[PDB]
Symmetry: C3
């Protein structure tokens, strides 16, 4: 499993969400964050998604395309290993908790 973090332009959130939803991924966590530029703050949105290793390329692909504008500040995708997930309500683990 992988924990995919996406930092994007706040206005691209719906496009990213619908795009992920189009590939069966609806459960995401959104966080309001800030970046910097010339030194002012620049509002951004952080999306965290927990996935199976097999979904990595598809996610990177759909997310890139959906978050894209072509103007600087489009954002980045970060990938890290997710060792375990537990669905609190049922106690289901990993893929059953995704």
């Amino acid at each position: 499993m992988k924990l995919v973090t996406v930092i994007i332009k706040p206005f691209k959130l719906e496009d990213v969400r619908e795009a992920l939803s189009s590939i069966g991924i609806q459960g995401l966590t959104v966080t309001e964050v800030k970046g910097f530029g010339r030194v002012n703050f620049l509002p951004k949105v952080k999306i965290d998604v927990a996935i199976a290793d097999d979904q990595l390329d598809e996610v990177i692909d759909i997310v890139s395309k959906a978050a894209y504008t072509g103007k600087i500040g489009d954002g980045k995708i970060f990938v890290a290993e997710l060792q375990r997930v537990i669905r609190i309500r049922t106690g289901e683990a990993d893929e059953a908790a995704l």
Copy 2:
């Protein structure tokens, strides 16, 4: 060491905190985040806790029980490897920084 992230219902925060505190874990980081549902935002709370590997099962156990309601949307526990921690004020490392 492990970095345990817990996404829960905002109103279950105190129960989770007191539960963790009951097992000697008081230092947590809380973040306000959002999830989605049928497509509206749903407020959530993210708790990040840095722990020793030996505390993983106990944490998963106490946290699950404390965050539980039985209604959907209870949340999830995510587990990742924590390679190093440094307590800024003293320079203490890892377990001494926990």
Copy 3:
């Protein structure tokens, strides 16, 4: 690559930013978070920085020094493995996405 997370006193943000900037690191993500104390909330700032393995010691060093006050609550540095990064706008990967 590594994902370095820094939790600090909100007022030390500029000092940390200028310090990182002094070593060529300008791209950071800032998040407003909360800690606890005796049980009240205590405002904090979370900075996430993506780096090459070779920058770890220098970052830990400059950040520690810059965030320091000597009073309790100074914060902590957490280190985790960053497996991949993709710059959305160009598709550049890893070091080219840093």
